[PDB]
Ligand binder design. Structure first.
Ligand SMILES: CC(=O)SCCNC(=O)CCNC(=O)[C@H](O)C(C)(C)COP(=O)(O)OP(=O)(O)OC[C@H]1O[C@@H](n2cnc3c(N)ncnc32)[C@H](O)[C@@H]1OP(=O)(O)O
Length: 364
């Protein structure tokens, strides 16, 4: 089941769309969570990859989604993958009704189906060794059926990927409560459609008492949602030794604040959640939540994405240039959505002899 198949299954019947599915070259990086000295085993390697998606309709971009996948290796038989859902955004320049919810769900379903070995086949080394040889890549193997985590932080903003798109009166911005429920629905469906019944499913709303969190969870179809998170309680539950540090994420932003305050050894997980809320509070306060899934896939992931599924630029420079045509554009008028589409289409054609992928919706 290709990305084309997945997207078509949730797009309106007989309607035409195009997509960009862009991916960075997998890179050896530091651990997701800050290591400690008391860990009897630390990761042998952590491999980070970015997937960046844009959907187009009628020659205009209207939706984008940024996802990072981390594969952490302890040895040949011991690995985990984590999908960090970073940013989802719209600009309101789609002239037809689509379910952005289902688009987002289905792209994550596609990512879950990818064999983690796909990211391990050709890994760019971290600078700290390997040395002078320029075209040297690492390769690893792991089992296909590995522990799979998904993490995201819900927090609304006028935009994340489409500058000034809130100036478009057609843009639909969810408030913090609606946005939590929206992502809640998406993850609930991923659990039911893609995860085994023994899976951890966690929700917390920083700064709030669990009673109200528990209230919401009662409407989920996955039967094992709990209030809390998927994080460990290493080192007397110090936040620094248990909180994953993700790109542009509020948790990492607050960890770095504690670092600047010299309090990383003073702040427990419980205080972290209170303070994360506390000290960004009044006029900018909106409902934020942290969601976590940890378990095994129902179907063993064995797909190595084709060129139709993903475009992997030969360099970070090319990757950056293409993504910037989306994120560096101005969307106060529809001309931004048109320009993003034309720039991307021309760049792909001119520099890569590639087309955006065409889709016809199949959903009745
Ligand atoms: C991890 C993270 O990324 S958190 C950050 C999330 N991103 C942002 O906050 C950026 C700003 N927000 C947005 O871009 C959007 O509001 C999104 C992406 C969150 C959701 O987009 P939407 O277009 O609202 O999504 P979707 O198609 O799923 O529709 C959701 C609901 O809004 C309704 N809706 C959609 N468009 C409109 C509209 N123009 N006017 C009124 N209602 C609308 C739909 O009917 C649906 O209603 P239902 O729940 O009663 O069925």
């Amino acid at each position: 089941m290709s990305l084309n198949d997945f997207l078509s299954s949730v797009l309106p019947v007989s309607e035409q769309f195009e997509y960009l599915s862009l991916q960075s070259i997998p890179l050896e990086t530091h651990a997701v969570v800050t290591p400690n000295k008391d860990d009897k085993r630390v990761p042998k390697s952590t491999i980070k990859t970015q997937h960046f998606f844009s959907l187009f309709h009628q020659g205009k971009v209207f939706f984008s989604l940024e996802v990072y996948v981390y594969v952490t290796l302890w040895d040949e038989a011991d690995a985990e993958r984590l999908i960090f859902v970073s940013k989802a955004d719209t600009n309101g320049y789609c002239n037809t009704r689509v379910s952005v919810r289902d688009i987002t769900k289905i792209i994550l379903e596609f990512i879950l189906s990818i064999d983690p070995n796909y990211y391990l086949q050709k890994v760019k080394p971290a600078i700290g060794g390997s040395g002078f040889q320029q075209d040297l890549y690492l390769s690893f193997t792991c089992p296909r059926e590995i522990l799979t985590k998904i993490c995201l932080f819900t927090r609304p903003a006028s935009q994340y990927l489409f500058p000034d798109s809130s100036k478009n009166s057609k843009k639909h911005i969810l408030n913090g409560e609606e946005l939590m429920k929206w992502w809640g629905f998406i993850l609930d469906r991923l659990l039911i459609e893609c995860f085994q019944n023994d899976t951890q499913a966690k929700l917390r709303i920083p700064g709030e008492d669990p009673a109200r969190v528990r209230s919401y969870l009662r409407g989920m179809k996955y039967p094992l949602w709990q209030v809390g998170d998927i994080f460990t309680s290493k080192e007397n539950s110090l936040a620094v030794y248990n909180i994953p540090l993700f790109p542009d994420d509020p948790k990492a932003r607050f960890i770095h604040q504690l670092a600047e305050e010299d309090r990383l050894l003073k702040v427990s997980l419980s205080s972290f959640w209170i303070e994360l809320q506390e000290r960004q509070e009044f006029k900018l306060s909106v409902t934020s939540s942290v969601m976590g899934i940890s378990g095994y896939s129902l179907a063993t992931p064995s797909l190595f994405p084709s060129s139709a599924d993903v475009i992997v630029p030969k360099s970070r420079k090319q990757f950056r240039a293409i993504k910037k045509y989306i994120t560096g554009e101005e969307y106060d008028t529809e001309e931004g959505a048109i320009e993003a589409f034309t720039n991307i289409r021309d760049f792909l054609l001119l520099r890569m002899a590639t087309n955006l992928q065409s889709l016809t919706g199949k959903r009745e």
